[PDB]
Design a binder for this molecule. Structure first.
Ligand SMILES: [Cl-]
Ligand SMILES: [Cl-]
Ligand SMILES: [Cl-]
Ligand SMILES: [Cl-]
Lengths: 475, 474, 473, 480
């Protein structure tokens, strides 16, 4: 028996679990053949995956380097200390002014850990409204229900876009903050295509004596490469995912000011008071054992973030998105805020006479992965009028500007098919659209042809994290 | 561009030799040590290959067939398969039980259950942390709320019977009458006996409280059917997917669904756990699922069904029984006098030395254990015991006579710690550490014992990697 | 028109509102002719009533003496300062160790103001369970509902009697407090016939670092007279009503420690930190303008509480209750805890085969005013009757008179048992129907009512003149 | 026989007059009677209570414990207390012309501030959201209040509050900004209630915002309830879900409070189901057993008396005179060069913005008080801090109760103006510019002290000519 469970523990995935091996092979082929346009997605490196898939997973290491509860952590401590050092270096941070926690398991709990560290239950948070481009982990409630648990345990109130311009209305944010008295203001967005006015947020936070939290998950790779302005110039605390544009493993980091803050009226120094509170909220407050395999892969990703090739990549992300936006506009699409200054665009489909749910169904069938998105002017939250698309993932595969001009063309062809399906549907409900989409032989053929166009275009580019020659599903 | 694509596809050895070397050092450490921390295990190569796969690249907020992002055909296959195998691993009828496989680890899994089923500041009871509980069930000292569970909810501990070392269920029941908990946790970390799940169920019924079983430490024993199952009684069951399950680092949340018992049907006839728990996980508290972990979890759960896995968990139990017997015969006192599971709790009081001193010597001779509070301790900062268990070394093929050897080397390390204390000048721990580092004679004793430990441990297979390709073979 | 509203403003109640004047005359007759046994009730002095019914009501005086928001408060300040100083004197308190707030409007908000001052929302309070003798203003919840809003805004947990002895189970209180970690423990009761073990509460509060709040509303006049042990030796804060056994106007006082508390391990003085928090919770926290007419009447009541005849009154309250208890016991009644050490008794009627609701209905019809009370096994109708001596002692009832009160109570119970036996159904509404329709039992109740009224009528009226009453028959 | 002598002594003590028992307290009351005879009482929340109300408040109704509600008590003896509370409820609905099938009332709340807290406790969970007029803009502490330093009102501790504000360019509530703020803040309850505000509420607009937000509309009419009862201004009951009020202030009753609430059908929803109002049981249970204990039956009985008075033609004539006096007061102030916040008044008070006179409200209030004119400093738009108020608040209810008519309030404005001129002389004679230098000059300048002495004598000689309210001049201890 004992020889038999040892053989099981050392066998390959192919031998032990052909069903799971097959699923992974199908997903590899999907990442080879598709336009991956979800702006939060990316393709991580082989070296990160090998670290995440390593025996670093086996160790329990509650606590912090040199201050653990378990023994045996000499090399786990090396990895976590190396990760912290590289995290500060990736954002060009002075370690006497900034510290970092690398144990938070993902972006959503990272924000909750900051709130738990710095706010009592039911204290007040302001953030960008979710339908205006915010994120659930900053709070969200509808008329009838608290949707994010941040809005259960803390008191949240949104700030909004200027409806005319599509940019954050900073004047209204400031006026709202006078009345609401937030103890923390979030400067961070998901579906927002413009740069944050961090200086203005800093002025509001100073006036309100509120914590300035920058949540840079969508843009952290752009920040690390220095191709957009840094929130670290202004923020008190910065959270981020380690995946998305950073191109690391799935995880998170929390950065915070430390050391001298200012001098009081009595000539006494006043120190920042974030580090101990945040580290203790992460552990023992809310998490248990760190995921050392992820932390080890994060250290790899943060070293990669320093290279000239990584900066060239992020510069290309920006140039690709600008050309993508330009081409969409030329083809008659409307963009929220009229364009982009970062890695994504927000298409408002209202002028085309069709909603994002119908378009996204066609996109899925032609192997264009995007996501439907609420846009300003939407009546129902469950009928999004927009589509969110971005450049990090396909830029990682080597798409350049002319390639994203073609992506915009193929998107437009998919919208035109969607409009044809709608024109052929009897009813106006989405189930009538879907039934037409699955019974109309002419339009099925058009979708099949566009699918082949998309796959033929995407397949020519390199695969990231695996080699084409050993793919099980080449056809 | 050809340049950055090349860096994305290069091996770890080429891209990051410093990190590669840390992993090689850790491989050698797992080869050469007695790993006795009862929450640790060695995961299979196949799980690691799934966790290290391109499944990590996908955003898939929502649930299978109810996503917000496109492109999730195959991620849906993996999550659906994972759920199916999770119910199968614990022999659960899918018309009566559901599962959420997206919770990132054991501690947030419990918080997500509380968020789903309790309003802020509602009341939870659970085993006291120094009595064998866990921080994710709440914990407050005289001066500070330590777990944020005790910040957002109102917690109260239940305790051991100090004379027997078992949970004092009579006191729990009386305490609950006054405190009126909305949820009672049946789950422990440093506890060597089986839970009286039937008694917890009786108390929860009387109190109209949710019965949450947190089986993180024992879930692999449960899956193999070698100890009684909390699913016989509980409303909700949380677990880590690592520890005795031997899966990736992650968590599962199981919950009753469908029709309630005849005598519990009222305004609603159906259980009201599934939607609340799934919604607390997403959109409540998490974002994108970690599909690489979910896929590795599917692999681990298939392994959990096999006869080899049942043989493994049988061996875990028989090893721990033998380990306990050998320790008792060498004079060690065990909390509750023995074990019924994967771990033992040594109370070092009868030896005249505390757990902090012994653990330092153990660490120096490559034996990984944990200092542990024992009934009778005056301070939670000065633990009088040591916790040790059998899952990790049993995975490497240790059997009963091997754990007799483990107990022998543990005993020799305690004898060395007692000598360091005798040679120590002062009474404080820094004087002990000063002796432990400066005494040439005792430094030699620890070196010799470290060699004995490593020579014994090296004879066994490495788990999840090959000896032949290790960088550090000495 | 001007002369028209001036006349209305200066006219007597008899001229302006004959209906209200008649209600008051009916109530005077009720207080003259009955056995008023509700232990929280008393008869207030004429001088207090004259102050409460004075033009002191007109001034707005938010803030505190010498620190008001509005002008014109010179004489309001004289009254409130005098009230405060007399309040400390009434309990023989050192004003360097004790302060007082006299603005709280009644006993229930006084406790809420203390919690608001000293505890954050959702922090923990222990107090005597309401059906075990506690009070709603210390918190209370059933299995299904939070009844007191104290239990909404704060996290409450009860302590209970030893139901074998009827005394508070201090052993279980102490063990519960270890697990529950209260920030504040209340030592105060309503339906409880025994003295509190304040020293034991102090020991538990010291161990838990909890605020010790004594709520002496039921017993404060006994404390003021020095005829039972004082909670002020032990407590951090003391709340009380100003009515009930103190015999003042309807209102409340909050007392708190101030000044030096102890020396810490570092040789540093640590001061009490209750005074500013409590004063600020009362105003601007939770109340607005003080009721200066009530505060002025309170000053009058506190002067009375100093006098020798007030002490003689409270000593008589105790002796009357002891005799009442002894007589009930001799007539075969069981008392919760077996007797009394204060102003009330708790009769457990279960050994007589009838409940408190049925008995209280008969008592009401024979002009005996009493309260009901739960006993072991209850909740449905309560099994007990609560009766006390402060009100009738104020009218001059002495020991032989309360022996008579116990006789007439016993006669009422015997009538209630006859109604129960004649009632051919088992429901309370069947009892009421029999009680209202049975001519013979109505005759027995009329006779006992006449006996009660004839006995009570001979004692002085308190606060008004018999000779000028409208209803002299 | 010492025991019988003691018993006779304590009975004698209980039946003796205040003059006999406590001459020190009796003396204080006599001083306060003289003070109420001699002053210009312009604080708009103050009034003079009738003798009949005071006689009921000072009655043996105080002796009864009556927890619960009429006919639903917990213990005996309450036949006549029930008559009083039932009569009080009936008269409360009648005083505001309310249909008892559409409105109920609770008359047990002990004062205006706990009445509002009881409504919040009844209708909102802890930490749910309330909006109300900002305290420096005319609001009240019992609606919530927080500064940059700390939470001041405990309403802001137990509930989550946010203010709405005036349009400081017009002096009116900025309803547009209220509506926009409410969209973001999502209040569960909005208070329509003001103290230091010279205008009436746009209840129709508050109703529209509450309907859009599915929020409870609470009108807190403490300052105006007597005007409402007399029908001389529009009623909040046309629109509000719940109405709280003090029973003192312009109602001219005892110190206490009332809570009114809708009953019956709210709407038929989209599924065709009747939605009933759910206020009565929640509010009555928040008052008892939630937050209070034994009702104060002396106050409830005096409230019944005050509510009967509120229905009379003489009371309506009184409230009409309150409004006419305030308009005449405002005319005279404008004619003498004063600026009024919002440009005028629609009610019982005025808010004078003193900025164009070159002196602030603290300085003027101090001089007014020395000449026995009672008024209150008041924040005005443009003030540097809430601690340096630029205005002064004055009203007509109390002196109108003593029979001041329009020509008398023209005289009050003249004497106010004379006090302002003295304050300006004190400021021009002051060494420094801080308030303490003003107070120093005010207390040592023999000439200006003499001017204030003369003005005080003018004020008192004018006020003394009017009837005293609630007591007789002939029996006063202090007749000069
Ligand atoms: Cl996205
Ligand atoms: Cl462990
Ligand atoms: Cl009582
Ligand atoms: Cl006012």
């Amino acid at each position: 028996s004992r020889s038999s469970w040892i053989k099981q523990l050392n066998a390959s995935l192919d031998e032990i679990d052909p069903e799971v091996a097959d699923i992974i092979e199908l997903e590899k082929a999907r990442q080879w053949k598709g336009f991956e346009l979800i702006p939060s997605e990316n393709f991580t490196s082989l070296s990160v995956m090998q670290a995440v898939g390593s025996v670093m997973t086996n160790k329990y290491s509650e606590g912090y380097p040199g201050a653990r509860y378990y023994g045996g952590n000499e090399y786990i401590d090396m990895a976590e200390t190396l990760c912290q050092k590289r995290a500060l270096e990736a954002f060009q941070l002075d370690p006497s002014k900034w510290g970092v926690n690398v144990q938070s398991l993902s972006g959503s709990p990272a924000n909750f850990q900051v709130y738990t560290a710095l706010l009592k239950p039911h204290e007040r948070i302001m953030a960008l409204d979710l339908p205006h481009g915010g994120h659930l982990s900053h709070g969200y409630q509808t008329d009838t229900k608290k949707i994010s648990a941040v809005s259960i345990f803390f008191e949240t109130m949104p700030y909004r876009l200027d409806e005319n311009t599509g940019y954050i209305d900073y004047d209204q944010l400031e006026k709202s903050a006078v009345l609401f008295r937030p103890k923390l203001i979030v400067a961070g967005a998901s579906a927002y295509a413009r740069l944050y006015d961090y200086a203005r947020i800093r002025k509001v936070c100073n006036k309100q004596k509120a914590v300035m939290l920058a949540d840079m998950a969508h843009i952290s790779g752009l920040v690390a490469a220095g191709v957009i302005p840094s929130p670290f110039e202004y923020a008190d605390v910065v959270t981020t995912t380690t995946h998305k544009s950073l191109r690391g493993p799935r995880g998170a980091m929390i950065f915070f000011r430390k050391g001298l803050k200012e001098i009081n009226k009595q000539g006494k120094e006043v120190m920042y008071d974030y580090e101990d509170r945040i580290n203790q909220a992460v552990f023992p407050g809310l998490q248990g054992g760190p995921h050392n395999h992820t932390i080890t892969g994060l250290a790899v990703a943060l070293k990669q973030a320093r290279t000239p090739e990584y900066k060239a990549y992020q510069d290309q992300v920006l140039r690709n998105c600008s050309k993508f936006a330009e081409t969409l506009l030329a083809k008659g699409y409307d963009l929220v805020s009229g364009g982009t200054d970062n890695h994504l665009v927000l298409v408002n489909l209202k002028n085309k006479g069709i909603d994002g749910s119908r378009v996204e169904k066609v996109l899925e069938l032609v192997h264009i992965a995007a996501n439907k998105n609420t846009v300003p002017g939407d009546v129902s939250a469950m009928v999004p009028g927009g589509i969110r698309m971005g450049t990090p993932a396909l830029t990682s595969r080597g798409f350049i500007e002319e390639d994203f001009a073609k992506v915009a063309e193929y998107f437009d062809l998919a919208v035109k098919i969607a409009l044809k399906i709608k024109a052929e549907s009897q009813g106006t409900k989405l189930k009538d659209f879907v039934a037409t989409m699955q019974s109309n032989e002419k339009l099925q053929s058009e979708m099949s042809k566009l699918r082949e166009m998309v796959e033929e275009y995407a397949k020519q580019f390199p695969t990231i994290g695996f080699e084409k020659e050993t793919m099980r599903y080449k056809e």
